[PDB]
Amino acid sequence: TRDQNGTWEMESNENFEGYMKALDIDFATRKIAVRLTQTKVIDQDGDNFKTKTTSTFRNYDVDFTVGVEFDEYTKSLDNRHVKALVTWEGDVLVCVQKGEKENRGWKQWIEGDKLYLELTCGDQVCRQVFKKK
Ligand SMILES: CC1=C(/C=C/C(C)=C/C=C/C(C)=C/C=O)C(C)(C)CCC1
């Protein structure tokens, strides 16, 4: 399905360390994060997405329309300008973040009552899994 709506609660988080190190996040921000549950809320209506991810540490909030290129300041993360574009490849939601870092983006998809998210930067991949709540 392409319907990614709802409230999603994290059940695993693989190599978030490596992904953050690839983005040049200070050792201490990485220490704080590294581990910590999370809730992602996706409100999607056709191509229009409003997403909230929440942790006890920092929020990162992302709204976009699929197929409409937009400039992203990645505020919560690594302090950067990117040209972000979100598109569909089959039922996989794909974001390419163009700028200094190579191979920067993410891919998100649904299989069952789970949401899967693969965050990439350079040679690094972080894999998250969420359950619908
Ligand atoms: C690095 C980092 C974070 C992660 C940010 C990410 C990976 C956001 C991805 C959002 C997506 C892919 C939304 C798509 O719908 C947090 C949690 C703010 C904690 C502080 C450090």
Swiss-Prot record:
Location comes to: Cytoplasm
Q: In which tissues is it expressed?
A: Higher expression in adult small intestine and to a much lesser extent in fetal kidney.
Coiled-coil residue spans: none
User: Per the UniProt entry, what are the Gene Ontology biological process annotations, in alphabetical order?
Assistant: epidermis development; fatty acid transport; vitamin A metabolic process
User: Which GO molecular function annotations are given, in alphabetical order?
Assistant: fatty acid binding; molecular carrier activity; retinal binding; retinoid binding; retinol binding
Binding-site positions, all-trans-retinol: K40, Q108
Role, per record: Intracellular transport of retinol.
Q: What domain notes does the record hold?
A: Forms a beta-barrel structure that accommodates hydrophobic ligands in its interior.
Report the family membership.
Answer: Belongs to the calycin superfamily. Fatty-acid binding protein (FABP) family.
Q: What is this protein called?
A: Retinol-binding protein 2
> Per the UniProt entry, what species is this protein from, by scientific name?
Homo sapiens
